[PDB]
C-alpha cells in the first residue's frame, strides 16, 4: 500500500533561467536588427508589398521579446503585482496584435494589392492595435504574483474574467487560423508558423480552464503529470516565439522578392 501523494514534473521553474534570459536577449537583438533593417531603406527593403504590416509584426515581436524576462521565474522576490500585471498585459497584447495583423493580411491581401492605401492602412493598424489592447483586459485584470512569481488568477471573483480571457485566447489562437483554413499540399502563405507556435497555447488553455474551474476531473497522477508537462511545453513553444517570428518574416521578405 503506497498511497503516496502525486507530484508534478515542474520543468520550467528556476533551474531553466537561461531559456528565459538568453531567449529574451536574442529576441530583442534579432527583432531590433530586422526593425532597423527596415527603418534604414538603404538595403532595398522598400520594394516589398505591404511592408508596414511586416514592420508592425516585427515591432510586436520586439515588444514580446523585451517583455519576456519580467514574468520569467528564476529571479527572486520583490516582483510586485504591478510588474507582473504589466508583463501579462503587454505579452498577451503583443500576441493578440500579431495574430490580428496576420488575420488582416491573409484576408485583405486583395485590398493591399492596390498599393499602400493611406487611409485604409492607417485605420486598420490603429483599430487592430486598439482592439488588441482591449482584448488583454481580462488577463491583466486576472493577474497576480503568488509569493512574487507570475501566475494567472483563477478565483470565484475572477471566474467570468478568466472565462472571457480563455475563450478569446481559444478564438484568436486556434479558431482564427483554422477558421482561415476552413472551406471544408497547403496553399496559403508560409507564415502559418506563427499560429503553429501559438496552437499549443491555444488548445491547452481550454483544458486548463475546464480543470481549474472544477467542471472536469482528472483520473490518475499520470493524467496530472501529462497535463502540466503539456502546459510547460506549450509555454516553451510560445516563448520561443521571440526568435521564431522575425526569422520567418525575413525569409518571407527575401523569398517573395
Amino acid at each position: 500500500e503506497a498511497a503516496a501523494p502525486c507530484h508534478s514534473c515542474n520543468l520550467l521553474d528556476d533551474s531553466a533561467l537561461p531559456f528565459f534570459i538568453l531567449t529574451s536577449v536574442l529576441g530583442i537583438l534579432a527583432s531590433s536588427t530586422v526593425l532597423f533593417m527596415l527603418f534604414r531603406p538603404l538595403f532595398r527593403w522598400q520594394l516589398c508589398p505591404g511592408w508596414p504590416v511586416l514592420a508592425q509584426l516585427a515591432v510586436g515581436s520586439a515588444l514580446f521579446s523585451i517583455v519576456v524576462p519580467v514574468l520569467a521565474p528564476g529571479l527572486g522576490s520583490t516582483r510586485s503585482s504591478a510588474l507582473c500585471s504589466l508583463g501579462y498585459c503587454v505579452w498577451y497584447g503583443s500576441a493578440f496584435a500579431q495574430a490580428l495583423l496576420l488575420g488582416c493580411h491573409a484576408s485583405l491581401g486583395h485590398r493591399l494589392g492596390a498599393g499602400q492605401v493611406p487611409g485604409l492602412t492607417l485605420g486598420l493598424t490603429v483599430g487592430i492595435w486598439g482592439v488588441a489592447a482591449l482584448l488583454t483586459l481580462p488577463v491583466t485584470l486576472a493577474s497576480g504574483a503568488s509569493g512574487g512569481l507570475c501566475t494567472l488568477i483563477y478565483s470565484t471573483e475572477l471566474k467570468a474574467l478568466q472565462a472571457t480571457h480563455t475563450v478569446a485566447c481559444l478564438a484568436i489562437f486556434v479558431l482564427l487560423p483554422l477558421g482561415l483554413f476552413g472551406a471544408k499540399g497547403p496553399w496559403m502563405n508560409i507564415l502559418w508558423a506563427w499560429f503553429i507556435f501559438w496552437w499549443p497555447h491555444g488548445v491547452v488553455l481550454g483544458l486548463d480552464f475546464l480543470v481549474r474551474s472544477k467542471l472536469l476531473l482528472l483520473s490518475t497522477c499520470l493524467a496530472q503529470q501529462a497535463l502540466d508537462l503539456l502546459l510547460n511545453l506549450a509555454e516553451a513553444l510560445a516563448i520561443l516565439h521571440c526568435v521564431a517570428t522575425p526569422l520567418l518574416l525575413a525569409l518571407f521578405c527575401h523569398q517573395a522578392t
Partner: protein
Amino acid sequence: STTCCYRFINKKIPKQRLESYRRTTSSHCPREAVIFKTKLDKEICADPTQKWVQDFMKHLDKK
C-alpha cells in the same frame, strides 16, 4: 510543486508513526485530500472525510 492526491484513502493509520502534518493545494487537484509526513520520512495522502482521520487531526499537537 503542484502537489495533489487523486486516490485519497480513508483507512486507519498508526498514531506514533507520523512526524508532521500539512495541507493541500487544490489548484489542479481533483477531490481534496490531506498530507501527513511519517516518522519514516515517507509522505502520505489520505481521505479527510473519515471519522478516524478527523480524530487524528484532533489528536495532532499542531503547535
